[PDB]
């Protein structure tokens, strides 16, 4: 025996485990860019456009999480969003994207 | 990155990020200050009750040209004016939209989709050596894209 | 004045046992079938008296007891279910489709395919 | 017991509890002051006496974040536009509605049914370092689930 | 005698009883007092004199909870709204009324059949230990229950 694994293989069948359920979906629309998708380029996470911009300039952070995340739901009005948090880490190297549909806090560390 | 800003949109005004009104779409981004005045309305129809209505907004903002009035003033209200202005003439007959715009309040309340119905404003304020205005008060008059439910609502806000 | 008893709900409305007897066949079948359109929900251990508790508390109606009955195969109600089991049930206006084509014209049933 | 509550719901505030505001449904619960500029209004029509009308409230509450803006002023305007927004596609189409709340004043006389009609506030009052705001005046205005008779209405106060 | 009543009905007030508004029916009576903005009107439709209109009243009155609140303001309320709202309900089919009252005014001029067609006030006043308010400004909006003759209404006063 071998168990499996969520990203891109299977978290459960279907949305039984509701939150984490969605949580799973957004993960497989978040490990993806642009060009890598058949049909949809533009499906999935829009790192190339919010990759590496200055940490502080945060009208174009704010601007970029907006739309990443209207698109997002656009793309997949099934999961709405609740809570989105950016937070700094120890060093300048360091940033958190997390993300819960009011419980699931799910969090990703990002780089600018 | 983004594209281009308008209003006080670096940090080098030393002001407070979240009393901040920014408005963001594909091409162009305006931030101001939260004036008073703002007020917004939601509300439904009956006569038994039919059915709803779309938000409403009314956002009064005012604009300072503290160091760069064609960056703060100029280029804000062209941005404005452009946004509100429906584009159904750009030679491409085959999606021409009014276009809408996404709006952030706070920082952390997002309105995905909303629509600059109305602007007004006034041009006597005064102007520098060259002529750009040096301060102005924006109202403007938005609508929701439809009649949101308590589902898409209440679970929006931070 | 003009009045009489009944209420549109009864599957028992087809005096038909054999008829009934299929109905109960086939929303077995769907019941025990997978179908996400299926609620997901185990059983509460006072159910055993009262299997339509649920149907009450989720739906508001009984009509749905039956169903469930059928759903855990019970001898009696004096009997308990196991508190856990996977417990499954459609959209109601889905039923009252199917049984409403069944007592007009539930005749070919199974497959239509040309007039 | 009961479910969330927002605004001033706990005796920790100190202050009379005759005095607070306070709206109930199944999974919700907001408590507020009644504050000053309350109306309320019954009438009729004619032409020979018609019929009547249900009744109507205009209730403007104040909302103080003392302690925790978190639950006193924003999960209280969330509540309250949750409320307000008629719930009418929440997977549930044998039964959705728009919902309505039972409202409690002075301790003593309750409203049943009341429907959350329409809703307004602003937004330009001061806010904390996250950015809560710190003080609201929402008004409300409420509509009677029917025209309720002199038998209704009479025996319903304390 | 007299069924039951509220508001200063008692002369232990000691005021003057000329300046206490009275309405009577059946089954209840109020008393308050005549206060500012009192005011009425009759008129009449033409194109060519066509026809005349039934009288109109707009009666504020100021109520006091001196002693006994339960008796001044809130039975008073209770009775007011209990009148103006229409009781068509009541299990007697056969003759069901919105009911009418009789108006007294400064002990002399008196109004047999008037329809209480409007009423409002404030609750934000302040209140007692129990909670009962101490005063209240309700207005009232009274109609004729005809077109009234001349001959019918001059020759009723004092």
Redesign the interface.
């Given at each position: 025996i071998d168990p499996l694994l969520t990203l891109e293989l299977s978290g459960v069948k279907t949305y039984e485990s509701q939150e984490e359920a969605w949580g799973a979906r957004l993960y497989e629309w978040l490990n993806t860019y642009q060009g890598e998708v058949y049909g949809d380029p533009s499906w999935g996470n829009v790192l190339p456009q919010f990759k590496h911009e200055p940490t502080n300039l945060s009208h174009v952070q704010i601007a970029v999480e907006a739309m990443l995340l209207q698109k997002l739901t656009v793309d997949l009005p099934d999961i709405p969003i609740s809570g989105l948090s950016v937070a700094e880490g120890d060093a300048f190297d360091k940033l958190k994207i997390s993300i819960r549909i009011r419980d699931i806090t799910i969090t990703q560390d990002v780089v600018l | 990155m983004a594209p281009i800003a308008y209003g006080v949109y670096s940090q080098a005004d030393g002001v407070s990020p979240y009393l901040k009104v920014t408005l963001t779409n594909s091409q162009y981004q305006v931030t101001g200050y939260i004036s008073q005045g703002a007020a917004m309305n939601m509300a439904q129809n009956w006569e038994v009750w039919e059915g709803g209505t779309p938000p409403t907004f009314t956002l009064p903002v005012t604009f300072i040209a503290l160091n760069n009035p064609f960056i703060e003033v100029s280029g804000a209200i062209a941005a404005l004016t452009a946004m509100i202005s429906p584009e159904l003439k750009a030679a491409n007959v085959g999606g021409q939209i009014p276009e809408r715009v996404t709006l952030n309040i706070g920082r952390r309340i997002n309105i995905t989709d909303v629509a600059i119905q109305d602007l007004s404003f006034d041009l006597d304020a005064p102007r520098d050596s060259n002529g750009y205005f040096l301060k102005n008060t924006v109202n403007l008059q938005l609508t929701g894209s439809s009649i949101y439910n308590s589902s898409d609502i209440v679970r929006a806000f931070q | 004045t003009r009045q009489y008893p009944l209420s549109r709900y009864d599957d028992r409305n087809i005096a038909d046992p054999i008829l009934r007897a299929e109905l109960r066949k086939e929303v077995m079948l769907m019941c025990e079938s997978n179908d996400?359109n299926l609620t997901?929900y185990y059983v509460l251990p006072d159910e055993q008296y009262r299997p339509d508790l649920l149907a009450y508390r989720m739906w508001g109606i009984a009509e749905l007891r039956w169903v469930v009955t059928l759903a855990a195969g019970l001898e009696d109600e004096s009997q308990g279910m196991t508190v856990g089991k996977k417990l499954k049930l459609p959209?109601?206006?889905w039923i009252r489709e199917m049984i409403r084509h069944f007592q007009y014209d539930g005749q070919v049933i199974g497959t239509l395919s040309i007039a």
């Open positions: - | - | 996400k997901i959209p109601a206006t």
